[PDB]
Each structure stands twice: as structure tokens, then as C-alpha cells.
Amino acid sequence: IDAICKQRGSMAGSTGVHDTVVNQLLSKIDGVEQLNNILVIGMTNRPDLIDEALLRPGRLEVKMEIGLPDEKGRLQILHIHTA
């Protein structure tokens, strides 16, 4: 998702295509028309590069961090891959 969504501005180009995309996405997810039968899942390696606006109440607003497993997780993974 970070490839498409980056902080408004902060880009050196005349076309300005990296801002209209973000604005259209923001309008569609949360606009005047109320659409409530959709769920969007976005995964990334660098949460910082994501535009701050998308991370707030109403828009996204639930964020999970997947960390390195523990001894039990390592045992389970090894069992799964050696079964």
C-alpha cells in the first residue's frame, strides 16, 4: 500500500498524479455516500511512509504488528514444515 499512498506533496513532479489517487481513495472509502458493506486490508513493511490521514478513527483505525515468534512458535513452525 505504501507504493500508492504517500504523504501529500513531498514529490517533485509537475503531473501531480500521486495526490489525486490518494484523494480519490479517501473520497471513495469515506465520502458523502455511505457504503458499509466493504472491508479493506492493507499490509506494509514501512508504516511510517503511509500518509498520516489514512491512519485515524473512521479510516482504517485498527493496526496490528506481527513480530518475531517465540520458542513455542518456532516449535510449531518446525513441526508444520517437517510433518
Partner 1 sequence: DMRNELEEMQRRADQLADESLESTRRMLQLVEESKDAGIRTLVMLDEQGEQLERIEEGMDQINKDMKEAEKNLTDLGK
Q: Which residues bind partner 1 (CB under 8 A)?
A: 12-15, 17
Spatial contact of 5 and 29, defined as CB atoms under 8 Å apart: no
Q: CB 83: neighbour CB atoms within 10 A?
A: 5
Minimum CB separation of residue 20 from partner 1 in Å reads: 12
Task: Kindly give the residue spans of alpha helices, DSSP state H, lying in 1-83.
Answer: 17-29, 71-82
Q: Which is nearer to partner 1, 12 or 64 (CB)?
A: 12
Minimum CB separation of residue 11 from partner 1 in Å reads: 10
Q: Which is nearer to partner 1, 9 or 58 (CB)?
A: 9
